[PDB]
Design a protein around this motif. Structure first.
Motif, PDB file in Angstrom:
ATOM      1  N   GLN A 197      30.670 -24.219 -28.910  1.00 39.13           N
ATOM      2  CA  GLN A 197      30.015 -25.040 -27.910  1.00 39.13           C
ATOM      3  C   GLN A 197      28.723 -24.442 -27.395  1.00 39.13           C
ATOM      4  OE1 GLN A 197      32.609 -25.994 -24.830  1.00 39.13           O
ATOM      5  NE2 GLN A 197      33.908 -27.436 -25.961  1.00 39.13           N
ATOM      6  N   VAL A 198      28.765 -23.182 -26.982  1.00 38.91           N
ATOM      7  CA  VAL A 198      27.584 -22.488 -26.454  1.00 38.91           C
ATOM      8  C   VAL A 198      26.504 -22.398 -27.539  1.00 38.91           C
ATOM      9  CG1 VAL A 198      26.772 -20.162 -25.779  1.00 38.91           C
ATOM     10  CG2 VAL A 198      28.709 -21.207 -24.602  1.00 38.91           C
TER      11      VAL A 198
ATOM     12  N   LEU B 184      19.466 -22.158 -15.191  1.00 41.36           N
ATOM     13  CA  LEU B 184      19.815 -22.789 -16.470  1.00 41.36           C
ATOM     14  C   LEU B 184      18.701 -22.791 -17.525  1.00 41.36           C
ATOM     15  CD1 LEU B 184      22.199 -23.651 -17.951  1.00 41.36           C
ATOM     16  CD2 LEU B 184      21.841 -26.006 -17.094  1.00 41.36           C
TER      17      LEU B 184
ATOM     18  N   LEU C   4      24.817 -25.837 -28.074  1.00 35.00           N
ATOM     19  CA  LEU C   4      23.950 -26.251 -26.981  1.00 35.00           C
ATOM     20  C   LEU C   4      22.712 -25.358 -26.905  1.00 35.00           C
ATOM     21  CD1 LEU C   4      26.557 -27.414 -24.394  1.00 35.00           C
ATOM     22  CD2 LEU C   4      24.625 -28.798 -25.262  1.00 35.00           C
TER      23      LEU C   4
ATOM     24  N   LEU D  13      29.378 -24.098 -16.580  1.00 37.33           N
ATOM     25  CA  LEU D  13      29.317 -25.592 -16.586  1.00 37.33           C
ATOM     26  C   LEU D  13      30.207 -26.187 -17.662  1.00 37.33           C
ATOM     27  CD1 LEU D  13      25.499 -25.818 -15.842  1.00 37.33           C
ATOM     28  CD2 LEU D  13      27.383 -26.675 -14.342  1.00 37.33           C
ATOM     29  N   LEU D  14      30.334 -25.464 -18.778  1.00 37.16           N
ATOM     30  CA  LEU D  14      31.239 -25.886 -19.853  1.00 37.16           C
ATOM     31  C   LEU D  14      32.699 -25.633 -19.459  1.00 37.16           C
ATOM     32  CD1 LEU D  14      29.579 -24.467 -23.149  1.00 37.16           C
ATOM     33  CD2 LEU D  14      29.951 -26.887 -22.638  1.00 37.16           C
ATOM     34  N   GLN D  15      32.886 -24.652 -18.550  1.00 34.94           N
ATOM     35  CA  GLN D  15      34.147 -24.329 -17.790  1.00 34.94           C
ATOM     36  C   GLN D  15      34.956 -23.154 -18.370  1.00 34.94           C
ATOM     37  OE1 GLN D  15      34.727 -28.090 -15.373  1.00 34.94           O
ATOM     38  NE2 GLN D  15      33.180 -26.512 -14.975  1.00 34.94           N
TER      39      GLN D  15
ATOM     40  N   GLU E  83      17.737 -19.325 -18.950  1.00 31.74           N
ATOM     41  CA  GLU E  83      18.829 -18.897 -19.841  1.00 31.74           C
ATOM     42  C   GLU E  83      18.811 -19.575 -21.194  1.00 31.74           C
ATOM     43  OE1 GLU E  83      22.769 -19.739 -18.877  1.00 31.74           O
ATOM     44  OE2 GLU E  83      22.954 -18.161 -17.272  1.00 31.74           O
ATOM     45  N   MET E  84      18.545 -20.887 -21.211  1.00 34.92           N
ATOM     46  CA  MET E  84      18.557 -21.671 -22.436  1.00 34.92           C
ATOM     47  C   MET E  84      17.380 -21.262 -23.275  1.00 34.92           C
ATOM     48  SD  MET E  84      21.160 -23.387 -22.341  1.00 34.92           S
ATOM     49  CE  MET E  84      21.282 -24.944 -23.202  1.00 34.92           C
TER      50      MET E  84
ATOM     51  N   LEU F 226      34.839 -22.232 -27.246  1.00 35.03           N
ATOM     52  CA  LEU F 226      33.799 -22.121 -26.217  1.00 35.03           C
ATOM     53  C   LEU F 226      32.500 -21.517 -26.786  1.00 35.03           C
ATOM     54  CD1 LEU F 226      32.633 -22.276 -23.286  1.00 35.03           C
ATOM     55  CD2 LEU F 226      34.389 -20.695 -22.621  1.00 35.03           C
TER      56      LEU F 226
ATOM     57  N   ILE G  61      25.601 -19.040 -16.817  1.00 36.63           N
ATOM     58  CA  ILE G  61      25.553 -20.344 -16.085  1.00 36.63           C
ATOM     59  C   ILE G  61      26.141 -21.383 -17.019  1.00 36.63           C
ATOM     60  CG2 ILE G  61      24.167 -22.108 -14.877  1.00 36.63           C
ATOM     61  CD1 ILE G  61      22.078 -19.996 -14.249  1.00 36.63           C
ATOM     62  N   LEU G  62      25.663 -21.359 -18.259  1.00 37.16           N
ATOM     63  CA  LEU G  62      26.081 -22.309 -19.281  1.00 37.16           C
ATOM     64  C   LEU G  62      27.600 -22.265 -19.499  1.00 37.16           C
ATOM     65  CD1 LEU G  62      25.783 -24.343 -21.573  1.00 37.16           C
ATOM     66  CD2 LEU G  62      25.032 -22.454 -23.111  1.00 37.16           C
ATOM     67  N   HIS G  63      28.135 -21.046 -19.580  1.00 38.98           N
ATOM     68  CA  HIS G  63      29.580 -20.813 -19.589  1.00 38.98           C
ATOM     69  C   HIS G  63      30.293 -21.527 -18.476  1.00 38.98           C
ATOM     70  CE1 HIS G  63      29.455 -17.550 -22.665  1.00 38.98           C
ATOM     71  NE2 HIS G  63      28.217 -17.330 -22.178  1.00 38.98           N
TER      72      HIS G  63
ATOM     73  N   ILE H 108      24.855 -30.928 -20.371  1.00 38.48           N
ATOM     74  CA  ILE H 108      26.079 -30.196 -20.611  1.00 38.48           C
ATOM     75  C   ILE H 108      27.287 -31.092 -20.380  1.00 38.48           C
ATOM     76  CG2 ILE H 108      27.536 -28.268 -19.859  1.00 38.48           C
ATOM     77  CD1 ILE H 108      24.728 -26.871 -19.207  1.00 38.48           C
ATOM     78  N   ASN H 109      27.234 -31.933 -19.351  1.00 37.81           N
ATOM     79  CA  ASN H 109      28.353 -32.882 -19.159  1.00 37.81           C
ATOM     80  C   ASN H 109      28.488 -33.981 -20.174  1.00 37.81           C
ATOM     81  OD1 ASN H 109      28.005 -31.940 -15.996  1.00 37.81           O
ATOM     82  ND2 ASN H 109      30.070 -31.953 -16.934  1.00 37.81           N
TER      83      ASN H 109
ATOM     84  N   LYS I 189      30.278 -32.343 -23.419  1.00 39.54           N
ATOM     85  CA  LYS I 189      31.733 -32.349 -23.287  1.00 39.54           C
ATOM     86  C   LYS I 189      32.424 -33.674 -23.622  1.00 39.54           C
ATOM     87  CE  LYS I 189      32.719 -30.372 -19.026  1.00 39.54           C
ATOM     88  NZ  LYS I 189      32.605 -29.070 -18.289  1.00 39.54           N
TER      89      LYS I 189
END
Lengths: 6, 226, 226, 8
Positions: C65-66, C217, C69, D6-8, C220-221, C62, D2-4, C48-49, C52
């Motif tokens: 992005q979600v 995590l 990923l 971490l992406l902020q 959820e993914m 946002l 959670i994903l939300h 995730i980092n 970004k």
């Protein structure tokens, strides 16, 4: 069958 | 043999190879999930026969052993039926043209959880329509599918290289700059990743249609994927 | 913002965004699965980092992005796994203290087939002499591309990365014919990677149906791919 | 979620 047709 | 073909000749052999478009037994008097799937599986089963004879005519294919030919077709068959479907539907925004007498929009997909595969197919058709995909490029992509899908699963790679040379040659001829040929080339091959995704989903959807009551060839091709 | 970058600065922004290599905790089915899921859960936080920092990605909304990923995460873990394993032919390097062979993949059912496909990809990267610079470009392509069909900006950024790839291939001396041939070979592998990620997703969901526990995590993914 | 975060 596929084998056959081929 | 296939290696000594020029770009025009590769294109002529592929366009000349193309299978016919088939009709379904769609009776528009007759109202069902069982019958709708029945119409689609009957069609796909007749299309599988023409695909087998089309694969034989793709430059390079008959240089393979029987085993390998069987394998590449076992991996690729739904992807090839899907891109053929998406291509005939290009000019029907919002519809899938299963056959000239069977044009369905997404509401009619509810009849079966097939609506998720429908939308995927619709969005690929849209993608093709935005990029204004050409008949010549389409026949290259379909051959790349047959050859590529099961390759990882040498001569095949040389032939794939020739089909790339052909794609680039179609694009130089269509007036595209060097930079644009390569971008179009990427975008076209990026779609094949989406096609592979829709084929894995459609396989899962097919399997569970059988495992809760198909034909010979179709059932056979389905069982290949376990 | 992304679009103002030169090919050299694209490469440097991507190389610098790379996640670190993580260690496993220091084999039955459940102990192995436990090690891999713990590892995969930690690598997800760094992915995730890394995401970004991929140029153009921060420009997306946002929820977009979600979406990207959630579509792409297992393909991205897989291609990183594949890249680290390149120099250990025969073996998969999950962490530097966790290098596994084919035979150890049997300690988990349904895993042996996924292992083999991962080994074939790494073997393929090895024989193409894939460089770190191309690798970072492919990883970015998978993030932007995998969910884009389920926008113009995303396509513009993919166009930017393609140019970066060709720029890398021209710097390395390859001819124009070799450049497009190589570009094709690299993108076609993305379609195998999509296929692996699909066998992998099913495998994970049925693991969840038995009982390795799946939380946080990673859970959820996985749920995101309904 | 959670994903939300971490992406902020």
């Amino acid at each position: 069958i596929l084998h056959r047709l081929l | 043999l296939a290696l000594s073909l020029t770009a025009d000749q590769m294109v002529s052999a592929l366009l000349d190879a193309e299978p016919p478009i088939l009709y379904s037994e769609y009776d528009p008097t007759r109202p069902s999930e069982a019958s709708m799937m029945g119409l689609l599986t009957n069609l796909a089963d007749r299309e599988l026969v023409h695909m087998i004879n089309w694969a034989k005519r793709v430059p390079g294919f008959v240089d393979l052993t029987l085993h390998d030919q069987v394998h590449l077709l076992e991996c690729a068959w739904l992807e090839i039926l899907m891109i053929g479907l998406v291509w005939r539907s290009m000019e029907h925004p919002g519809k899938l043209l299963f056959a000239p007498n069977l044009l369905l929009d997404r509401n009619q997909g509810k009849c079966v959880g097939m609506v998720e595969i429908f939308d995927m197919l619709l969005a690929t058709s849209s993608r093709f329509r935005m990029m204004n995909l050409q008949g010549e490029e389409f026949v290259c992509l379909k051959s790349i599918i047959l050859l590529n899908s099961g390759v990882y699963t040498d001569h095949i790679h040389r032939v794939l290289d020739k089909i790339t040379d052909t794609l680039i040659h179609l694009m130089a001829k269509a007036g595209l700059t060097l930079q644009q040929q390569h971008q179009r080339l990427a975008q076209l091959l990026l779609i094949l990743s989406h096609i592979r995704h829709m084929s894995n989903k459609g396989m899962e959807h097919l399997y569970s249609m059988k495992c809760k009551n198909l034909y010979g060839l179709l059932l056979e091709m389905l069982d290949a994927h376990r």
